[PDB]
Amino acid sequence: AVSKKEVLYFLSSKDAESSTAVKSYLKSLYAGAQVEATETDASELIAQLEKKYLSAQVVEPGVHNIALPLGESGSAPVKRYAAELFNLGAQAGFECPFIEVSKKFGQETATSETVKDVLNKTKSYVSADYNAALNEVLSSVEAEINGPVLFDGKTEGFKKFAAKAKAVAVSRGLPADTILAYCAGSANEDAADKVSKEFFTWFESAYTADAAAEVKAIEAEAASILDRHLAKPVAQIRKEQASAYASLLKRAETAKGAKWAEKYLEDVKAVQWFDASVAEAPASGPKVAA
Amino acid sequence: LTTFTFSGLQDAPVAALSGSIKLNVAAKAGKAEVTVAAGAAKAATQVSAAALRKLSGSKISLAEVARISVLHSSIQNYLLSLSNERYQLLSQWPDFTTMYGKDFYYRAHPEDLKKFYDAADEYYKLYETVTEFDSLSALASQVVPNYAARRRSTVHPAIGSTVADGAFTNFLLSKQ
Amino acid sequence: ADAKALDELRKPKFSSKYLIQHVSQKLIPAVK
C-alpha cells in the first residue's frame, strides 16, 4: 500500500494503476478502517523535495499513456498532445506552465542585485538564442551606464535597457506588450478580454511550437535510429537485440525484494500474455473481460 | 466528459449520409421512432427526449489496450510508417532475375558480372533487413527513455523554449 | 488465466514509477 501522502496525489489523477490502488484503498476505508493522520511537519525543503519526487509518480504513468502525434498532418494533433500534457501537468500538481516557470524565476532570482546576475543564474532555464540577444543589449546599456545595471526598475538605465529588451522580445516574435499587460492585469474585465485573447493565442502558438519541436526531435531521432538500423544484416540485428534484451532481463533479475524489479518481471509476463492473446484470436485482438 | 450533457433529440441528426447504413428518424414531440436500415438487418426503436438524457449518465471511459504502452505503440507506429517509406523504394528496384541467364554471363566482363552478382546479394541483404518487422518493437524502446526523461522535469512536463522565453520577458520587463 | 480485465490492461507497462517510488522511500526516511 501507500504512506498516505502518496495517496492524496493519486485521488485526482486519472491514470490506471493509480486508480486501481486508490480504489483498493477506498475499499479498505469502507470496512471500518480509519485514515492515517497527515504529518503537519517536514519544513519547506522536505516539502518541495517530496512534492518533486511524488509529482514524478504521477507524470510518469501519465507520459506513457499519451500518444505522440508523429508525422500526422495539420496542427490539431499537436494540440491534442500538448493539451493532454497540460492536463497531465494539472493532474500531477503543477500549475499552468507559464506561471510555473515564472515561479521558478522567482525562486532562482529572489536575491539578485544586478541584471547580469539575472542573466547568469537563469541561463539554463531560458533559450540561449534569446540569452545571447539579451547579453548583447546588456553590454550595450552597460557601456553607456559605465556601471552594472542594478535590478530595481526605478533606474533610467534599466528603463533604457528594458525599452530595447522589449524591442528584441518583439523581434523574436512574441508580442511583449500583450504579455506584460495580461500578467500585469487590468481592472475592467471587458477591456482585459481582448488582451487575454491575444495572450492566449500567442500562448497556444507557443506551446504548439514547444510540443511540435519535441515531436520533430522524436521524428529525427527515430529516423536516425532506423537509418542506422537498416544498414545492418539480420544476423547482427537478431543477436544484438536478443543480447540486449537478455542483458536487461538479467539486470532486472539481479535485484530481488525491491518493488521495481518485481513489477518489471510482472509486466514481462503481461507482454508474454498479450502475445498469447493476440495469437489466439487475430480478428479481435486481446481478450478483455467485460 | 462533464457530469452533465445538454444534447439529445433537439437539433438532432435526422438522416444518414451513407448508403452503407440508412437512418430515418420519426421524431415526435414526446417520443421518437428511429427506423434504421443497415444491411440485411433492420431496427425500429423508440426513444423519448428524456430517454436520451439517460445516455450520458454512466460514462464510457475508453482506453487503449496496448502491448507495452500507448507512447511506445506510437513510436513503433512511426517506425513502421518509416519502414514503409523505405520499403516502397525497395519496391522500385529493377528485376535482375531476368538477367540471371548464362547468355548475359558470357557476354559480360568478369569484373562487371562480379559487381552485378554482388549488387544482387546486396539487394537481398537490404530486403531481408527492411522486413525484420519484429525488431521495431525493440527499436522504438531506445527512443522512449530520453523522451520520458525529457517530460519528467522539475518544473513542468510541457514546458519548453518559447514559453520560457515569454515568461522570461514577462519576468524581466516588469518592475524588477 | 486469459481475458485478464480492463483495468489490468490500461496500465502503461515499462514506465518507471517504481524506481522513483523506491528512491523516495529510501530517500525521505533517510533525509528527515
Binding site: 518533486k52 514524478a56 516557470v101 539554463s124 532555464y125 531560458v126 533559450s127 540561449a128 519541436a213 519535441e214 520533430k216 526531435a217 529525427a220 531521432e221 529516423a223 536516425s224 532506423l226 537509418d227 542506422r228 537498416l230 544498414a231 534484451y245 536487461l248 532481463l249 521495481w260 518489471y264 514481462v268 507482454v271 | 507495452i68 511506445h72 517509406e85 523505405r86 523504394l89 525497395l90 537490404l126 518493437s137 525493440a138 524502446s141 531506445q142 522512449v144 527513455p145 520520458a148 526523461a149 525529457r150 519528467r152 522535469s153 522539475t154 518544473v155 514546458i159 519548453g160 523554449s161 520560457a164 | 515499462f14 518507471s16 517504481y18 524506481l19 522513483i20 528512491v23
Partner: peptide, 30 residues
Amino acid sequence: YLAPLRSDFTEEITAPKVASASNLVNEWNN
C-alpha cells in the same frame, strides 16, 4: 522491447536537439 528505467529529472529547459535526417534514402537511390 523493454527499456532501461531511468529516474532523473531534467533541470534545464532547452531545445530538444533535433538530429540530422540521415543519408540512407539517398544511399539506397545510389
